[PDB]
Amino acid sequence: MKELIYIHEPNILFANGQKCADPRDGLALFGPFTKIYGIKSGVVGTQYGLS
Amino acid sequence: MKELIYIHEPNILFANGQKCADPRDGLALFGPFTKIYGIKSGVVGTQYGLS
């Protein structure tokens, strides 16, 4: 019998110094670490692509 | 006797296409023609300059 050690999952920071193990959860519950004002999109494609 | 014709002040568009003759008044009253989400500053100076 060979014994396997377990490595604890490291934590990734989010807003307010809060920690969660899943980015999809820490983002949904707490939000990004630093916020931007907004995103100004730019599209380079056909008329179908822009729609 | 020399006659001077008069040219009237033109109007500059502001937010929502509203017109005024002074930017210092048109902006303070109506707002810019196009609004941006925000301005991320960037400073290249001393600690004194940053302060």
Nearest-angstrom CA–CA distance, A41 and A18: 30
* Residues of chain B with a CB closer than 8 angstroms to some CB in chain A: 36-40
- Contact A28/A18 with Cβ under 8 angstroms? no
Q: How far is A34 from chain B (nearest CA, A)?
A: 13
The alpha carbon torsion through B8, B10, B15, B18 (nearest 10 deg) reads 40
Q: Which residues of A touch B41 (CB under 8 A)?
A: none
The coordinates were experimentally obtained by cryo-EM
Nearest-angstrom CA–CA distance, A31 and A40: 20
| DSSP assignment of B5-25 | --PPPPPEE-GGG-EES-HHH
Comparing alpha-carbon positions, the chain A residue that sits nearest to B35 is A40
Q: Which residues of A touch B40 (CB under 8 A)?
A: 36-37
CA dihedral sign, ordered B13, B18, B21, B24: negative
- Contact B21/B12 with Cβ under 8 angstroms? yes
Q: How far is B5 from chain A (nearest CA, A)?
A: 47
* Closest C-alpha to A30, from A13, A47, A51: A13
